[PDB]
Amino acid sequence: GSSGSSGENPYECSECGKAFNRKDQLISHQRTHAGESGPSSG
Ligand SMILES: [Zn+2]
């Protein structure tokens, strides 16, 4: 593994464990692991 390690994923999710090339990409993705709009009373 010359010139560092294979592949460069400076951004990786914690919920699923995905990896993106750009930050924004990961951010927009994280949205999937979020959905609190409706008034959850229970
Ligand atoms: Zn994820």
From Swiss-Prot:
Renumbered zinc finger spans (C2H2-type): 11-33
Compartments, as annotated in UniProt: Cytoplasm
Expression induction: Down-regulated during erythroid differentiation by GATA1. Down-regulated by HTLV-1 Tax through the CREB/ATF pathway. Up-regulated by the regulator of nonsense transcript UPF1. Up-regulated by the cyclic AMP-dependent transcription factor ATF4.
Tissue spec: Overexpressed in ovarian cancer tissues compared to normal ovarian tissues. Isoform 1 and isoform 2 are expressed in squamous epithelium tissues. Isoform 2 is overexpressed in squamous cervical cancer (at protein level). Expressed in blood cells. Isoform 1 is expressed in pancreas, lung, skeletal muscle, heart, placenta, liver, kidney and brain. Isoform 2 expressed in chronic lymphocytic leukemia (CLL) and several tumor cell lines. Isoform 3 is expressed in several tumor cells. Isoform 5 is expressed in fetal liver and several tumor cells.
Source species, domain of life: Eukaryota
Coiled-coil segments: none
UniProt free text on domains: The KRAB domain functions to reinforce the nuclear localization of isoform 1 in addition to its transcription repression activity.
Assembly: Interacts (via the KRAB domain) with TRIM28 (via the RBCC domain); the interaction increases ZNF268 nuclear localization activity. Isoform 2 interacts with CHUK and IKBKB; the interaction is further increased in a TNF-alpha-dependent manner. Forms a ternary complex with TBK1 and SETD4; the interaction between SETD4 and TBK1 is ZNF268-dependent and leads to TBK1 monomethylation.
Function: Involved in the regulation of antiviral interferon signaling. During viral infection, recruits SETD4 to TBK1, leading to TBK1 monomethylation, which is critical for the assembly of TBK1 complex and IRF3 signaling.
Family, similarity comment: Belongs to the krueppel C2H2-type zinc-finger protein family.
Identification of the protein by name: Zinc finger protein 268
Organism of origin: Homo sapiens (Human)
Range covered out of full length: 749 to 777 of 947
